[PDB]
Swiss-Prot record:
Tissues of expression: Expressed in cauline leaves, rosette leaves, stems and flowers, but not in roots.
GO cellular component labels: chloroplast; chloroplast outer membrane; cytosol
Shown stretch of the complete protein: 757 to 982 of 1004
Signal sequence coordinates: none
Any one biological process term the GO annotation gives: chloroplast relocation
Domain writeup: The N-terminal region (1-25) is necessary and sufficient for targeting and anchoring the protein in the chloroplast envelope membrane. The coiled coil domain(123-341) interacts with the plasma membrane and anchors chloroplasts firmly on the plasma membrane.
Biological role: Required for the positioning and movement of chloroplasts. Interacts with profilin and actin independent of its polymerization status. Regulates chloroplast localization by anchoring chloroplasts to the plasma membrane and forming a bridge to the actin cytoskeleton.
Domain of life of the native organism: Eukaryota
Protein name (Swiss-Prot/TrEMBL): Protein CHUP1, chloroplastic
Location of region: Leucine-zipper 2: 46-67
Subcellular location: Plastid, Chloroplast outer membrane
Keyword list, A-Z: Chloroplast, Coiled coil, Membrane, Phosphoprotein, Plastid, Plastid outer membrane, Repeat
Description of the deletion phenotype: Defective in chloroplast photorelocation movement, leading to damage of the photosynthetic apparatus and subsequent bleaching of leaf color and necrosis under high light conditions. Chloroplasts gathered at the bottom of cells, regardless of the light conditions.
Length: 226
């Protein structure tokens, strides 16, 4: 008895697809024209375009089924969408890092774990980018899509910079916990905690490619607690 609902719905859907193909034809063609012609030099303008494109296609009952019947630049549309998504994703990431707060209500274990996961997420994102970037640039260049954001001096550079800020917060936490109570340097919990500090610092340093004065002062301050 659910099958009657199913069948009705399916029927209404197929109907709607014939409807969109027959009454929204030159609309679709208008879109395809706009997509083919499009080019950009700043990724923001592309974002605006993709936003517009999504809103427009959202008027088709189903992208796949309808566009199937038209001379539709599938490759370029997918690439536009992809670049929009990737850049937005990387930017959400840089923001999450720069504005990360280390909750004073958390004890050292969960707080440091949070920072560790954030670091792993950053590392994976950037590594994925670096391994797909050449290919992507080739493609995008062909399609008129900005690629400067993919360069070492684009978003990945920004993320690398923000990771150093993360290092600052991490060492701040380690120093703080190491001061909150007083014990001997030979307590395996305390030694371990100190080492977590140092290892995280070094991991970030190798990742980003250097520190600032402030980072450095924190690193020295830690390495002089041994």
């Amino acid at each position: 008895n659910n099958m009657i609902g199913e069948i009705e719905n399916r029927s209404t859907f197929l109907l709607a697809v014939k409807a969109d193909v027959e009454t929204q034809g030159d609309f679709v063609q208008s879109l395809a024209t706009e997509v083919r012609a499009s080019s950009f030099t700043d990724i923001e303008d592309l974002l605006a375009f993709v936003s517009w494109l999504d809103e427009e296609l959202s008027f088709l009952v189903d992208e796949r089924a309808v566009l199937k019947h038209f001379d539709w630049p599938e490759g370029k549309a997918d690439a536009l969408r992809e670049a929009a998504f990737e850049y937005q994703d990387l930017m959400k990431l840089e923001k999450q890092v720069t504005s990360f707060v280390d909750d004073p209500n958390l004890s050292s274990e969960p707080a440091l774990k949070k920072m560790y996961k954030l670091l792993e997420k950053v590392e994976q994102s950037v590594y994925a980018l670096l391994r797909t970037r050449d290919m992507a640039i080739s493609r995008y260049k062909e399609f008129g899509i900005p690629v400067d954001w993919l360069s070492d001096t684009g978003v990945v550079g920004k993320i690398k910079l923000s990771s150093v800020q993360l290092a600052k917060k991490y060492m701040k936490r380690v120093a703080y916990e190491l001061d909150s109570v007083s014990g001997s340097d030979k307590d395996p919990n305390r030694e371990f905690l100190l080492l977590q500090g140092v290892r995280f610092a070094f991991r970030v340093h190798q990742f980003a490619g250097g520190f600032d004065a402030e980072s450095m002062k924190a690193f020295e301050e830690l390495r002089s607690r041994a």
